[PDB]
């Protein structure tokens, strides 16, 4: 299930100038474009080698779009201050997520287009791509205005047409990096704790994509409660890492086995200490 998504954020800063405006684009949850209004020379920039193959009219057109969006968001941050009747001297946040998920054939599966104010839901386009869900009375104003203007049709034109179409092109031109598969390299470390028992830590390193499951068995039974587990984290080089640990008696370490499941593995790895 592929996807093309854009995450947009504007943060006001009273007495420090105009709001900081940012865009990030992702394909299959992997970052590839980025815009930062506070950058030395602000323009749309490549963030993966594969997108670099696009010509200069692509970067100019997207830079043109980004700088226009930044202007629409300057207005909106002001429109939001009055709806909620807030002081003008404080910092606020407007976030915008938009994109398309696609099933194997190629045509749309779900369209997204939702906004959040100060970290809370504000308005979101329903699955029908025809109506809007508002979170409070402020967003009800926005809803009827966008209803009167016909915002769903124009927004739906993007999601079903262009978004779907360009994602199809991004996957063809970037398949080698996007759809690559890096199997995790696994190993187990030993750690004698003061209490007298042991911590067995099972590491997974250098894998892509991100999804993975670490599980500790004992004589075939999963030990999902006594297990410790960090959130999957980025290595910094495009791959990911994760570890899972358990506490076991000294001497019986060879009874426990760690199981690593990843789409780069035809079969789950199994390892002991």
């Amino acid at each position: 299930s592929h996807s093309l998504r854009y995450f947009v954020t504007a943060v006001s800063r009273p007495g420090f100038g105009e709001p900081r405006y940012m865009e990030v684009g992702y394909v299959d949850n992997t970052e590839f474009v980025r815009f930062d209004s506070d950058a030395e020379n602000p323009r749309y920039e490549p963030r993966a080698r594969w997108i670099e193959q696009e010509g200069p009219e692509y970067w100019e057109r997207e830079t043109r779009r980004a700088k226009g969006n930044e202007q629409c968001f300057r207005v909106d941050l002001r429109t939001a201050l009055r709806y909620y009747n807030q002081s003008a001297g404080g910092s606020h946040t407007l976030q915008w997520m938009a994109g398309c998920d696609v099933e194997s054939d190629g045509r749309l599966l779900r369209g997204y287009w939702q906004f959040a104010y100060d970290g809370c839901d504000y308005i979101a386009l329903n699955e029908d791509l025809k109506t809007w869900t508002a979170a409070d009375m402020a967003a009800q104003i926005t809803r009827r205005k966008w209803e009167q203007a016909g915002a769903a049709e124009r927004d739906r034109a993007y999601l079903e047409g262009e978004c779907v179409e360009w994602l199809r092109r991004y996957l063809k031109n970037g398949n080698a990096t996007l759809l690559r598969t890096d199997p995790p390299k696994a190993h187990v470390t030993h750690h004698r704790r003061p209490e007298g028992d042991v911590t067995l830590r099972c590491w997974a390193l250098g894998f892509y994509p991100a999804d993975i499951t670490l599980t500790w068995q004992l004589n075939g039974e999963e030990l999902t409660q006594e297990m410790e587990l960090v959130e999957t984290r980025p290595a910094g080089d495009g791959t990911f890492q994760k570890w899972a640990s358990v506490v076991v008696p000294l001497g019986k370490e060879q009874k426990y086995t760690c199981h690593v499941e990843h789409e780069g593995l035809p079969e789950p790895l199994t390892l002991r200490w």
Partner: peptide, 5 residues
């Protein structure tokens, strides 16, 4: 490509 406003 991305969306606008």
């Amino acid at each position: 490509r991305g969306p606008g406003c």
